[PDB]
Structure 1
Amino acid sequence: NFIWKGFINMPSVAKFVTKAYPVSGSPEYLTEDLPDSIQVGGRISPQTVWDYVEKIKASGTKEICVVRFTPVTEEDQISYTLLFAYFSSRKRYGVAANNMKQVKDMYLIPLGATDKIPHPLVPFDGPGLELHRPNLLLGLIIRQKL
């Protein structure tokens, strides 16, 4: 019941195969809307994302969904961890640079195992996350509405 399997690729940092699972919002059509390899093009301050997400919700023109990434093999898990640490240590989110037509924005969020969920994502409208969990990379996906 993963909705997409593909690479995350941050040049000079980490590249790995991952499966995405739904967390919040409708994951419908994500299999067609995500590229084979999500290219991480840069980094962004979390407050900038949350200010933007507030405007997105106010505008009523987009759908927000949240997925969680899991490494596929033990080798993937080493690089997944490097990427988590990259953004966690710098208190940044990642920015996808090769979005497909239906996705306006995609951010990669490190969520520490003992972290509180960022408030603009609560409440989760979907399976959510387990209380007892590893360090995780989430994807925050802004999609166009019909």
Structure 2
Amino acid sequence: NFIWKGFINMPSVAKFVTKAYPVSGSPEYLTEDLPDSIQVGGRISPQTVWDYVEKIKASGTKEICVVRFTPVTEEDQISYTLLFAYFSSRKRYGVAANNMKQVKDMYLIPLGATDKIPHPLVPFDGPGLELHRPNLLLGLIIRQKLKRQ
């Protein structure tokens, strides 16, 4: 069902358990590669991210993988909403800090219930997102293109 269950930690703002579900791209090997806790260690301008995503689609060198995070408990929902409010108000995305197995970069993106899906994730190669949804924290995972053992 879900790809990965663990923490999303931003020091001195919020941290909570969450489960990740596929949205677009290949979710293969994410279960083993992702750590038990994802440290989010700064903000970034969204257009700096979408330009990097544009050049990453021209070069067939890395694959985009979008996932959807949901809180597991209602006390995790209190912090989930806090982290969504931090990035949505400042109009920014989050960046992961861990040195992970294959993730070249990972970006946490706030997506409001009624906001239009950003243009660079345009058609979803996966389950996608329903029309009626709550405020969501989206995971933009960037991984090197290869086939493994």
TM-score tier after normalising by the smaller chain length? over 0.9
Q: Deviations over 1:45-75 (max 9, x none)?
A: 0000000011111111001010000001000
1:83-98 equivalences in 2 (<5 Å):
83-98=83-98
Tell me the CA shift for residue 145 of structure 1: 1.2
| TM-score, normalised relative to structure 2 | 0.96
| Farther off after superposition, 53-62 or 10-19 | 53-62
Deviation at residue 43 of structure 1 after TM alignment = 0.6
Percent identity between matched residues is: 100
Asked whether 1:121 is paired with 2:103, we answer no
Deviation >2 Å, runs of 4+: none
1:55 is aligned to: 55
CA displacement at 1:101 relative to structure 2: 2.4
Report the secondary structure of 2:8's partner residue: strand
Do the aligned residues in 2 keep the contact of 1:99 with 1:105 (CA within 8 Å)?
A: no
What residue in structure 1 maps to residue 141 of structure 2? 141
Name structure 1 gaps, 5 residues minimum: none
Matched residues in 2 for 1:68 and 1:129: separation?
9
Cα displacement string for residues 69-122 of structure 1 (whole angstroms, at most 9, x for unaligned residues): 000100000000000000000000000000412000100000000000001001
Q: Distance in 2 between matches of 1:144 and 1:49?
A: 17
Q: Is the 8 A contact 2:44 2:94 kept in 1?
A: yes
RMSD over aligned CA atoms reads 0.6
Partners of 2:56 and 2:33 in 1: how far apart? 19
1:35: how far off? Answer: 1.1
